[PDB]
Design a binder for this molecule. Structure first.
Ligand SMILES: Nc1ncnc2c1ncn2[C@@H]1O[C@H](COCC#Cc2nc3c(N)ncnc3n2[C@@H]2O[C@H](CNC(=O)c3ccccc3C(=O)O)[C@@H](O)[C@H]2O)[C@@H](O)[C@H]1O
Ligand SMILES: Nc1ncnc2c1ncn2[C@@H]1O[C@H](COCC#Cc2nc3c(N)ncnc3n2[C@@H]2O[C@H](CNC(=O)c3ccccc3C(=O)O)[C@@H](O)[C@H]2O)[C@@H](O)[C@H]1O
Ligand SMILES: Nc1ncnc2c1ncn2[C@@H]1O[C@H](COCC#Cc2nc3c(N)ncnc3n2[C@@H]2O[C@H](CNC(=O)c3ccccc3C(=O)O)[C@@H](O)[C@H]2O)[C@@H](O)[C@H]1O
Ligand SMILES: Nc1ncnc2c1ncn2[C@@H]1O[C@H](COCC#Cc2nc3c(N)ncnc3n2[C@@H]2O[C@H](CNC(=O)c3ccccc3C(=O)O)[C@@H](O)[C@H]2O)[C@@H](O)[C@H]1O
Lengths: 254, 254, 254, 254
């Protein structure tokens, strides 16, 4: 098949990439970083994140594989040759994604971990509207909308719940909300199903720091930020069983 | 249709029940508390909880309606006559339920809010096993497994996330877990999809205080406590739009 | 000096106790468990807790030393002989204590870690009164009032802050408080200085499960539970520097 | 006495200021905003914060009074005339302050609420050193060191404990710390007594966003940030009893 390999950039990842390419040359495998059918990421979760966004316009035609030299990298470097033979002769598991829409022309972004909004300096104030219904006025440091696979990332440090990636949903968590006689927020994290639209609408300041996974851009003259579960999904190539809860156990428990 | 009405027991609920029965007598409505097709609960969430368990063996043939004199009671007392006329001439919305299985003969319970486990005196210690995989050893005050509609109840006070009832899932939260050099738990709440089985297995003490909604019984010589999303669902009769997030807003925000 | 040694009860602690007694026989040391001036605890924090309560009526005349075979046990077993020689030929550091007063005859208890109140079955409801001022009505699972040295124990798992033992204060934390349209608590932990009196007063149910360190007794017909920083302090014998924050680091960080 | 009045700037505060000045003209009161002995702040907590920093070099010779048109403003506007007569013919209560020292020439700042450190873009990473002892390596969004009176502000939203202002201490809370297999922080808030020095030392990035109450400046080429309880205190003029816990009750409970 058409494949490609991205590298973290250090010595260990660059050379593991060159050796896997050599082993692929002994099979009917064709290296192509323009229309690959397999995208292999060698490095960390940040490296895998970059590979996903590099090919986010052909997600429905690509299967991702991660090698940590990680959550999205569930393959050890010493198992590379077995991964070569396994890939040459698999099942695809799909994780949900988050669609972020920023209105001012409209701009849309796709997220594998989460998308967060913070102030451009000063207090962060937005009205939270759930399906055209005003739910709360948030005043604090920011908000974070996470995918299921992203719940073990930023969402976890903010007190969010960890949810299995088979659940097509998104989770919204708060960043240091003020709560007194005049300001009131739900405080608890919120989990939204598909087709539920969460709209963040500015009150006074219209400039916000908007992040999508590892990217963070200052957005000027913002009118609306819409969050919803994307119809697009990321596809993983799975050769062996590695349950999500076991991956959670190995990363945080023991 | 065959209907029945349960009452909180105070003067306001008992008399609202008698007046609704009188109005039902002016239509083709038959009072029957043995095989009712409509169960009307008048009181609070605890009153509705008792009505659900009173007819938990005929859930697939009953539509519940709540009147608060509440979360499950989404009808004001002054709207009773309109509810009578509306019911006489609706759509059914279904919420997921939690199945609790206690092994020692096996005992099974059905939950609308949550099921919790605490110690029978002393430290509460159980091994948490997710799909036959040992995830953690919990040592603390207890654990709480909540339905989606139950996430705004006990689950919320324990730091759990609020999730929409259209998501067929269950959420597990901790009660004062100890975490030091020797004891380690995930800390974050966990959200499980259907067909995922969470098994709590004792370590030394085998007596536990097990709750199912408002009931709490001491269980002796416990070998296993299994949690899973039930295949059974509770059915509500809906006459007007009242979104779950608006019900959340009115109960906690304003 | 007059000394005594208490043991955890296992083989390792019983024999380390007998060997230290033998080494003490080579100095001007007199074993006496009635009027000891040095109390050596060999085991864990629970063992040290029992030694403190065993001699809580002569605290101002006793210096405690802990050996973990721990927080209050800051001596390794292999350093026992050096501890014998050091003790034979020190500085005393003092930690604050918590006074608990239960009115119904009045009963008073002294705490090194904390004192907690829970319900005797059903919801736990008390009015919280701070210096004769009604601060809140607590409805939930319980409350915990911790000493400074106790903040790394139960208080920590409840979300309480860790505070240095040189601060003469007490910290109150919540256990799963309900907060909605009708019930409201502060949520945050509260730190009280000396001479501040925190009074918990029942509303309807008068039976409570009251704990003091490792002891837990059901108290019937309770009228008031008063918390205040005790004028009595526990005295430690210190031979080397071991800062509290380093003890915190070694127990939770690395 | 020599007095001065600062105003929020809106119509209600500007005119209440002019009327109080007129009433002061009927007594032996001299307006002086260079060497005032009484500083009256009319507005909100942010207005009072500006008055404190306006005269932070003569704190030991000034008594502050707050009027909310608040926590530091504990006087209603309708009680202004009584405040004029009361002031003409009081007791001083003192609150502790936080000293922040930034090394690169050395720069020192005084805080009434708190001082926070965040990254200049990217991850915030500092080593936390308590009394020349490495306690942890913090990686996350930031850290917050609060005074006692500041614990009800930013510290509260970050999960910090509320402590009485008579306790000469400072409290450190985390902002979204990452905790996994490689990163580990204490998580709990830390309360430090006087003479304890908390040093934050950079790891790689040396630019930080440092805040002191309402001011926030980007600091370049930072080598150390030292936190300690200041020897300086702010002095309030008190005419009637208004306990701190009652002020907490009125602001968050009812
Ligand atoms: N305050 C916060 N606390 C926790 N996480 C935060 C966060 N602020 C952003 N993030 C996160 O940063 C990610 C970008 O990096 C790649 C990744 C990944 C990543 N995905 C996951 C995942 N699905 N599940 C579990 N771990 C993950 N990781 C692990 O995240 C760590 C990487 N991050 C940081 O160390 C980091 C921490 C704090 C601040 C900045 C960074 C930073 O580097 O930017 C690595 O160990 C990865 O293996 C963003 O997507 C935010 O989720
Ligand atoms: N520590 C805890 N903190 C918060 N909740 C706790 C909890 N311990 C159990 N629960 C809960 O008690 C429920 C039994 O009661 C009927 C109900 C209901 C109920 N359902 C819901 C719901 N789906 N969503 C939102 N609110 C709900 N409510 C509201 O819950 C309040 C009732 N409870 C208590 O006041 C209460 C609080 C503390 C302790 C005991 C009780 C008690 O009464 O037993 C009422 O306002 C209801 O309207 C159990 O199912 C546990 O969920
Ligand atoms: N839900 C809770 N979560 C955390 N702690 C809780 C707690 N419920 C009570 N406690 C606590 O139990 C203590 C009685 O035990 C001796 C001690 C001690 C003890 N002091 C301290 C301390 N100053 N600083 C740091 N660690 C300490 N320890 C360490 O506490 C662990 C002992 N406890 C348990 O394992 C335990 C955990 C959960 C439930 C029950 C027990 C139990 O055994 O009763 C051991 O590792 C000790 O070294 C009570 O004083 C409550 O503070
Ligand atoms: N994420 C956070 N969550 C909570 N607080 C935060 C915070 N980030 C900074 N702060 C805080 O902002 C303060 C500057 O403002 C004057 C004051 C004061 C102030 N002192 C206190 C106090 N001792 N006790 C109780 N309330 C206080 N207040 C009340 O704080 C509210 C003012 N603040 C904001 O609304 C605000 C909220 C979020 C974000 C920005 C702002 C902002 O305006 O900058 C007003 O109601 C005041 O009455 C800084 O000192 C940070 O403590």
């Amino acid at each position: 098949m058409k494949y490609m390999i991205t590298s973290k950039g250090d010595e260990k990842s660059d050379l593991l990439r060159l050796n896997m390419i050599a082993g692929f040359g002994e099979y009917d495998m064709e290296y192509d970083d323009v229309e690959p059918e397999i995208v292999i990421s060698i490095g960390g979760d940040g490296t895998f994140l970059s590979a996903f966004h590099q090919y986010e316009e052909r997600l429905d035609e690509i299967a991702f594989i991660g090698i940590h030299t990680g959550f999205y990298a569930d393959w050890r470097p010493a198992e590379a040759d077995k991964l070569v033979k396994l890939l040459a002769k698999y099942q695809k598991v799909s994780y949900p994604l988050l669609k972020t829409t920023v209105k001012y022309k409209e701009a849309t972004y796709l997220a594998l971990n989460e998308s967060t909004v913070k102030s451009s300096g000063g207090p962060f104030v937005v009205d939270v509207v759930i399906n055209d219904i005003h739910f709360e006025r948030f005043r604090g440091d920011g908000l974070c909308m996470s995918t299921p696979s992203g719940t073990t990332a930023y969402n976890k440090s903010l007190g969010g719940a960890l949810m299995h990636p088979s659940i097509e949903a998104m989770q919204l968590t708060e960043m240091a909300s003020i709560n007194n006689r005049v300001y009131r927020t739900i405080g608890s994290p919120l989990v939204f199903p598909k087709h539920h639209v969460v709209s963040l609408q500015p009150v006074n300041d219209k400039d916000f720091q908007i992040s999508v996974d590892h990217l963070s851009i200052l957005h000027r003259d913002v009118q609306e930020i819409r969050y919803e579960v994307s119809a697009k999904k990321i596809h993983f190539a799975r050769f062996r069983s590695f349950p999500f809860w076991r991956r959670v156990h190995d990363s945080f428990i023991e």
